[PDB]
């Protein structure tokens, strides 16, 4: 049990694309999206 150190030092190596790379890796875990039935409100 150590209470005298900061254990959130990972975010010092995050870069420009870190967030959108993780979102790209999560894409395989997602469920199929619902559909409104048309390509868009202008269709």
């Amino acid at each position: 049990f150590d209470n005298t150190t900061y254990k959130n030092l990972q975010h010092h190596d995050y870069s420009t694309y870190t967030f959108l790379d993780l979102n790209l890796d999560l894409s395989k875990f997602r469920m199929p999206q619902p559909s409104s039935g048309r390509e868009s409100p202008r269709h």
Partner: protein, 430 residues
């Protein structure tokens, strides 16, 4: 009980508030996160909402509506549309930084809360809207969400309960107004963050035009503990209808500005002295406090002596708990300038949609700039009071009310200061 405070560390919900333990899944699990989530999920929405209602929890985003009743607007049969939970992580109120610590140090509490809170409403997914300036915190949350997906805790058959749930994270682009619940929805839909009129209500027509519930990060993150430990445990802290613990941000002229979890209804003086190390220069040096983020009116030293930090106590003092961000100002502060800077903030944040705030807040900003220099007449103080009353209650969202209330608190408690500022200016230019 008649006195509140001194929350034992074993009764704190955000036990990694300071990030001195591992924030990833292994750390989270060791602290009790994700424990028996399957059993909670199989209890059913009615049981989950029962626990939240009995806990007496109230929304931590600033408005404080009873969470259990609010989440029950979703407990109704699907009409063919998907149902969504939107987690307000915009964290924009000046003085407020509580949601930042939850997101980056206890992300698995938020994720589990989304699942538990999403199950109670019957949602298929959760969108966690987070302000774009929190890039590193958003990345931490993205790492945690991947771990939850990898362990089978979210997604298909979440936790082994057979409930499918996705947790998406979407980033803002720099707008305080996007913390407003309906402007947040508009921002997710790729429009300008302009709040909607109500009705319809988000529980009927929300994100993508679908049933939606918008919940603050703190409100969602505490729900799993309330289910595990029960509403009765939560309702045992704080005054009646002011239940539970609360994250407080103490900033301004304190010795040790910090974030800390503390019982609801703890005295304001106790919170500042116990945790923040007291007012800079001692308690006698206190001028005023903004007890719940910039939108709440300030209260002077005399009121701050004995006021409790809960929803009903602070209303009694002509203010509000808000987000529980305590900004302390000592006697060296130029109180007129401090308030004038907050109006300038609301001028830069107004979405411009509706007339009273688009025009009124910029008007109040121009008047407050002259009040800082005393380049005004005393008759303008009552005019400025009336202008604020015209904005408040006549706008689409509460940002207009959040700009009128600070001005009223200044005029209410420091009118002699304003008048003496004008008298000085007149004497110099005569």
């Amino acid at each position: 009980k008649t006195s509140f405070g001194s929350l034992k560390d074993e009764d704190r919900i955000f036990t990694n508030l300071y990030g001195r333990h591992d924030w990833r899944l292994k750390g989270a699990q060791s602290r009790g996160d994700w424990y028996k989530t399957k059993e909670i999920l199989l209890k059913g929405p009615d049981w989950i909402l029962g626990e939240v209602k009995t806990s007496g929890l109230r929304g931590r985003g600033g408005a404080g509506f009873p969470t259990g009743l609010k989440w029950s607007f979703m407990n109704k049969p699907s009409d063919g549309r998907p149902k969504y939970l939107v987690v307000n992580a915009d964290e924009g109120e000046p003085g407020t930084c509580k949601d930042r610590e939850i997101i980056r140090h206890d992300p698995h509490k938020l994720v589990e809360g989304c699942l538990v809170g999403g199950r109670a409403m019957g949602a298929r997914a959760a969108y966690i809207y987070i302000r774009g300036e929190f890039y590193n915190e958003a990345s931490n949350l993205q790492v945690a969400i991947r771990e939850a997906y990898e362990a089978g805790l979210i997604g298909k058959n979440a936790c082994g309960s057979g409930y499918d749930f996705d947790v998406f994270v979407v980033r803002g682009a720099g707008a305080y107004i996007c913390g407003e619940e309906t402007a947040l929805i508009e921002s997710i839909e790729g429009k300008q963050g302009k709040p909607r009129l109500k009705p319809p209500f988000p529980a009927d027509v929300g994100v993508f035009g679908c049933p939606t519930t918008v919940a603050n990060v703190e409100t969602v993150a505490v729900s799993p503990t309330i289910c595990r430990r029960g509403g009765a445990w939560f309702a045992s802290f704080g005054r009646e209808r002011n239940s539970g613990t609360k994250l407080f941000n103490i900033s301004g002229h304190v010795n040790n500005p910090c974030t800390v979890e503390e019982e609801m209804s703890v005295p304001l003086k106790e919170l500042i002295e116990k945790h923040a190390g007291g007012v800079t220069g001692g308690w006698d040096n206190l001028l005023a406090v903004i007890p719940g983020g910039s939108s709440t009116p300030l209260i002077p030293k005399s009121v701050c002596e004995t006021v409790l930090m809960d929803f009903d106590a602070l209303i009694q003092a002509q203010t509000g708990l808000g987000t529980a961000a305590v900004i302390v100002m000592d006697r060296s502060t130029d109180i007129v300038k401090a308030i004038a800077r907050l109006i300038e903030f609301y001028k830069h944040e107004s979405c411009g949609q509706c007339t009273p705030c688009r025009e009124g807040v910029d008007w109040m900003n121009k008047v407050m700039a002259r009040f800082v220099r005393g380049d005004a007449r005393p008759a303008e103080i009552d005019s400025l009071w009336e202008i604020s009353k015209q904005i408040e209650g006549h706008t689409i969202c509460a940002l207009g009310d959040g700009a009128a209330w600070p001005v009223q608190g200044l005029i209410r408690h420091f009118r002699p200061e304003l008048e003496e500022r004008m008298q000085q200016f007149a004497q110099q230019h005569q």
